[PDB]
A and B are shown apart, each in its own frame.
Chain A
Amino acid sequence: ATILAEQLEAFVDPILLRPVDDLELTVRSANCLKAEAIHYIGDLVQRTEVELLKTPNLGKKSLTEIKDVLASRGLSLGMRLENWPPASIADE
């Protein structure tokens, strides 16, 4: 093996991060939140439900759809973010 080697050394939250339109509900339930220039459900969780109820852009059926979405407790739980990002949501 020494001879043959020397013969070769000259070669070698996921619901909040998802969009409102990605929700299982209809497009109207997403558009009710999207009328306030919201694209992510994290923006919906950043605002209170009372603040959304004080705007007539949401409808009566949209309130029931929002309740059905909040029944999973992933969104609209009355939270407050920095702007968008949590610590797990970090830039890398």
Chain B
Amino acid sequence: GPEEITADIPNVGEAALSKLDESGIVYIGAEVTGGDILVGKVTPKGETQLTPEEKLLRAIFGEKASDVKDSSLRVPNGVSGTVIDVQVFTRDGVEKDKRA
């Protein structure tokens, strides 16, 4: 499967996405620190094969064709700033989310 640009991801904290909106991308104007999350991004993990203990998880959660890790964009360690401008470019065919 592809990657998820939505905020819906695990291993987070109120400090993990308290500045993000409901669709992963940081606000325009949110004054961030060094090491926060700007874009939340989750990617796929292992495929292998359907295990005996995960046979019920093969198809029982809509988008259960992919796994979930963590590869969100972060401010590189050291720099502050204020997000002034956000661009979102979409390859044609892909579903535009609510912020695009």
Q: Establish whether A and B are touching in the complex (CB under 8 Å).
A: no
Q: Chain B residues in contact with chain A, CB under 8 A?
A: none
Residues of A at the B interface (CB closer than 8 Å) are: none
